[PDB]
Design a protein around this ligand. Structure first.
Ligand code: HEM
Length: 153
């Protein structure tokens, strides 16, 4: 359970992301895909992209970055009371997109890295730990839905 202090650190940085959601989404998906290439294989939409320059030039990849971060923003802003928002994301990610929990770990590391790059003065260690906690709570509650559905592993 995050404290109100920890949520304030999380949402203070997330307000900085919302000035350039698309650039953040491109950098986080690129980092995901470069750091963990198995992840790119899950997107039929993007698996033609073979260099980081092709990834940077794809408007479709930029579009999906904003889809991702808009969903994640809506979940952080519920501070933990996000059951309505996860049900569907867990359902589609387990049963249609076939995304293991551990790939949610991977995109969480990429999210933390890009926020440290772009907002170091609002993403000191206190804020890095709170945001780690918020992403862990996201993963925990999605893993419990996976498990319900027979996909935790
Ligand atoms: C912060 C974590 C994530 C969030 C908030 C998120 C959010 C979304 C949303 C809102 C959609 C479109 C609606 C839907 O299908 O449910 C989506 C689509 C999709 N996601 Fe995610 N996602 C996350 C992580 C991932 C990861 C790590 C992967 C792959 C490794 C992935 C794979 C996909 C795929 C394959 C689709 C369909 C894309 C397409 O073909 O249009 N997601 N995601």
């Amino acid at each position: 359970v995050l404290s109100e202090g920890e949520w304030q650190l999380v949402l203070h940085v997330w307000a900085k992301v919302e000035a350039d959601v698309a650039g953040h989404g491109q950098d986080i998906l690129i980092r995901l895909f470069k750091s963990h290439p198995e992840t790119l294989e899950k997107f039929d939409r993007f698996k033609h992209l073979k260099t980081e320059a092709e990834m940077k030039a794809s408007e479709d990849l930029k579009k999906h970055g904003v889809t991702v971060l808009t969903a994640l923003g809506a979940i952080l802003k519920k501070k933990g009371h996000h059951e309505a928002e996860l049900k569907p994301l867990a359902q589609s990610h387990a049963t249609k997109h076939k995304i293991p929990i551990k790939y949610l770990e991977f995109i969480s590391e990429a999210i933390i890295h890009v926020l440290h790059s772009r907002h170091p003065g609002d993403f000191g260690a206190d804020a890095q730990g709170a945001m780690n906690k918020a992403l862990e709570l996201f993963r925990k509650d999605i893993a419990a839905k996976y498990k319900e559905l027979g996909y935790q592993g």
